Amino acid sequence: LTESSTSKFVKINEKGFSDFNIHYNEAGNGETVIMLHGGGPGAGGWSNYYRNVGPFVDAGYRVILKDSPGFNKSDAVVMDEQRGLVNARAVKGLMDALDIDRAHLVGNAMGGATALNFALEYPDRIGKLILMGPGGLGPSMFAPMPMEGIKLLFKLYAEPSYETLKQMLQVFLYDQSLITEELLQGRWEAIQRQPEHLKNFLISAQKAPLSTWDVTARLGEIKAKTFITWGRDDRFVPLDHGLKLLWNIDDARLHVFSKCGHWAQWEHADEFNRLVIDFLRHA
Amino acid sequence: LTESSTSKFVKINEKGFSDFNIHYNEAGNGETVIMLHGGGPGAGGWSNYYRNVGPFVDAGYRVILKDSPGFNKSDAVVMDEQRGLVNARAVKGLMDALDIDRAHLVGNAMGGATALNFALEYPDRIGKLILMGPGGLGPSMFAPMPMEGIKLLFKLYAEPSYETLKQMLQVFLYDQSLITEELLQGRWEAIQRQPEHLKNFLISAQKAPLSTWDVTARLGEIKAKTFITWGRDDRFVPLDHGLKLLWNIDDARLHVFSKCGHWAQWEHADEFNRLVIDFLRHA
Amino acid sequence: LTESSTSKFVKINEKGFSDFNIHYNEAGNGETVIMLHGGGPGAGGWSNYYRNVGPFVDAGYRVILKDSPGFNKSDAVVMDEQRGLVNARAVKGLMDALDIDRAHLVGNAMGGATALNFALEYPDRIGKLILMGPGGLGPSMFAPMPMEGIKLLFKLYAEPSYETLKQMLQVFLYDQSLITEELLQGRWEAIQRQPEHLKNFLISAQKAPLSTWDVTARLGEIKAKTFITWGRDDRFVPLDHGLKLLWNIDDARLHVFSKCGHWAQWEHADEFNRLVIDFLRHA
Amino acid sequence: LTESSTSKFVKINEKGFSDFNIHYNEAGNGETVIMLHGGGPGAGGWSNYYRNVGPFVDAGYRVILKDSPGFNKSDAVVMDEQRGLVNARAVKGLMDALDIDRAHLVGNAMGGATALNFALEYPDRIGKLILMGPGGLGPSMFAPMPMEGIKLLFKLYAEPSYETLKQMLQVFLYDQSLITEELLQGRWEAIQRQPEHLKNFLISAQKAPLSTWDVTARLGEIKAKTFITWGRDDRFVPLDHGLKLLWNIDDARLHVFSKCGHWAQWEHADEFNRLVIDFLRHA
């Protein structure tokens, strides 16, 4: 599988979206799993999930790696509401356009917020819910905020450079030997290709600060079986939020990887794939 | 499989053990997994693990459910040293007697302490290490100690009764509907059958308080791949010790079950079996 | 000062209170500090605060030790709403009746909930806010709930006895040598004297469970300078809620006493008095 | 009081110190309080404590603001052992030279480590112990390490510049409006004046990593009454270590300031002075 061979586009129409272009990468043909990426500069579906798509397809799933609005090859957008909710509306728009009745959701960071909002707003349209360090869930009981990683994410948005990108990735990943030229070049290309996305994210962040993303109070509504993952060494979203989710969602479990930053599905891809495939099959 | 058809005895000889009788339940014939029980009145291998033995044997493992010294059908003993270490010596004695070169260890509560001590003392004799709420790892950062459950464990040891047993099990288990007459009757029989074990545990506890079991300082020595499990709702061993292990053991992961007391392998048997079998196969 | 010489009664009239009798103990004549007690069987103003009233009066404050509705010598009541809010309405009723424009509030456990609700509902009527282990603030990130102490509080409410009272106090206090016959006899007298209060608390708890007391979402509204106290060894309200308050209230500080249960103002009276008087004088 | 009018030097002789020059600032003449600074580039006694010296002297204490070896105007040194212990030896050397039998100790960050080591090694030479975010106490249960602030401290040591200094101070302090030109210029002067100190700290850090400073296992030996302070927003030493100390030292209390970085005695000077003076007077 390659980004090119799996690349697709679909126009969506959903509350506040009109003929809005969504890019996604699709492979496989069984039960649908939609994977939702984080909010870092240059993020997108393929970039975030290319170590996961193959094994999930091998296990018999139809995998859709979705580009959220204002990311990668999806249309540019300025959001005046919290991104989790607006992103979730876009997932519903995609599913309606593709005639997908229910999807399992996998979401990291901003994508975790997207998945939580989708589960809240459209409970009859979700299967299982998989969350990797979801962002925007209010204060930490231990971590000063904004977190170290978030400071770097904003610096990279406001002053993009290859060096600042490298700096960000060094904090993003636990194992520094994972930061290859290929990784750097790929994220840099996506940043260089879509400068308007960077500008628009910043405008959106001023309109709807991170506090507006906090759906903690509604977590008791979630009936989906939920699998929460965290990197022990995540400098972007606080580990104690894994406990917050575990205590507030009815049917959840929490899996924390040692020696793992803010990109668990990539840093610990083999274990992540096995655990999540097992969860989707058997839970 | 039944307790009767799997029941075996072996005399061990190891530092401080001379012709000492160890009872165990064995099934299967592949790689050896030794499962080690907690320190509650009436505990034993079969009692603690009967929801796990079958699936592990089905997966191709040789499973040994070991009765630790001073429990169930193993010989009575008064220990002047911390139980984790003395128990670990008994595991080594068993393996030597049965010509087992290396074993994967699974241990809950006191059994987790046993497994940690074994990994520390005999690193060339362990495969993988699976820990379910290990006991004796020093103070909690959040929980007043002794924990609620430990108070009840001591009350049951000093004044055994069916009612106190029921009280203990209500705190031990999250889901009260799991407390059947069968469970109560089985633990009660083991308590009634071996009064000397109760008396001896109490004498041992005075000689070597829980503080003596704390091997925290040596956790960096552990090279075994480690899978740590905790019940979110464990009132016997504090959840933050799961983090202590995760931060201090080189290669660990932490899995926490929601709606789960101090007996995770039984309360969440299906998920526990799948996760741990996957870990032994693939990690 | 004695309970008898300071005892006073006042009828209040405030939303849902009509000619409702409130008992309080008053001493001193400077700035008013209203101290609000917890929800344990037999609790009341004098009982909870008799180690604090003298030093506060000596420091120049007018101290009012208030009996909340459905406690001690205040009128009996069944509440269909969360007690923090209803109690706060009663504090406002008291202050209006006594022509008190603004009061500093000190509240432990249920009294902490009362004080938080009062600060939220009547921000122009509060000076400073002092909180000792406030109850009802949602789930803990670490403690299984209901907490050990809360189980005992309900057992004592439903089946009051001197022995169960003693059991409760042993968990309530860290230092067992503080549990004198005088303490036991005093709480027992208050329990024996007002059986209707016990029955009514239980009815109220069914109508408005602890979840309804959770005002976490509104903590950002609090503009009062706030001093939060916790017992390190509090088995009734979880220590991590001290952090929750510290992170969510604009201007707060947190002081945790070692070797201290759920009654910090009594167990560590000298240090508590010095700290809180200093806070009221200088913060 | 000024740095100039209080400046003094004394040669010390103590295990591994021979005719070693220690600079300190002294004022007042009552009971001795020795204040011990952190390990940041350009740190020293006066710099760290100039908002505290006056009020403590006013309260009747003799205050000694000590420059630790390899800082400010004390002699240069390369340490092959953990700095807490070596620093503590230097405090003993100072006290012996000045005929001080017992001192109260106040220590932030590295200075907190110094104070803990002194209490451990010389228990008959300490009065009370005051700790502000002591460094080197092993892993955090929540914070990825090295902490954000520590990364910046090392960057400033290895590549000193005014800009990197400003960057460091922005993370060091919660309230950005506290970062005046005066503060920046003062720390910069101390960095420019003693380049050898920067080089030597780095050499020392390679010889004795932060893990070697961890005296956690010995905290039970401390008999001094202890007051622990933390900034809620400390990005240099993890808040949960405040709990570690509170649970492990016999007689401790913990005070956490909101809106406070890694320099609590300066950021919240008025409250810090009142609390600590009260503690020394009355505890």
Ligand SMILES: O=C(O)/C(O)=C(Cl)\C=C\C(=O)c1ccccc1
């Ligand atoms: O995976 C990526 O897209 C990425 O590189 C990052 Cl740094 C994602 C961060 C968040 O989405 C985030 C959002 C809100 C709060 C915290 C983190």
Ligand SMILES: O=C(O)/C(O)=C(Cl)\C=C\C(=O)c1ccccc1
């Ligand atoms: O599984 C059992 O055997 C059992 O019923 C219990 Cl209550 C085990 C508790 C501990 O082993 C334990 C030991 C030290 C500290 C905390 C718990």
Ligand SMILES: O=C(O)/C(O)=C(Cl)\C=C\C(=O)c1ccccc1
């Ligand atoms: O001080 C007392 O009145 C007393 O003895 C107790 Cl046990 C108070 C407990 C609570 O108010 C409480 C309320 C809600 C949640 C947790 C504790």
Ligand SMILES: O=C(O)/C(O)=C(Cl)\C=C\C(=O)c1ccccc1
């Ligand atoms: O107050 C200062 O001297 C200063 O500016 C800093 Cl940044 C001190 C940091 C530590 O001493 C430290 C040492 C070990 C671990 C963590 C922090």
Ligand code: NA
């Ligand atoms: Na490489």
Ligand code: NA
């Ligand atoms: Na049933």
Ligand code: NA
């Ligand atoms: Na006594």
Ligand code: NA
């Ligand atoms: Na200014």
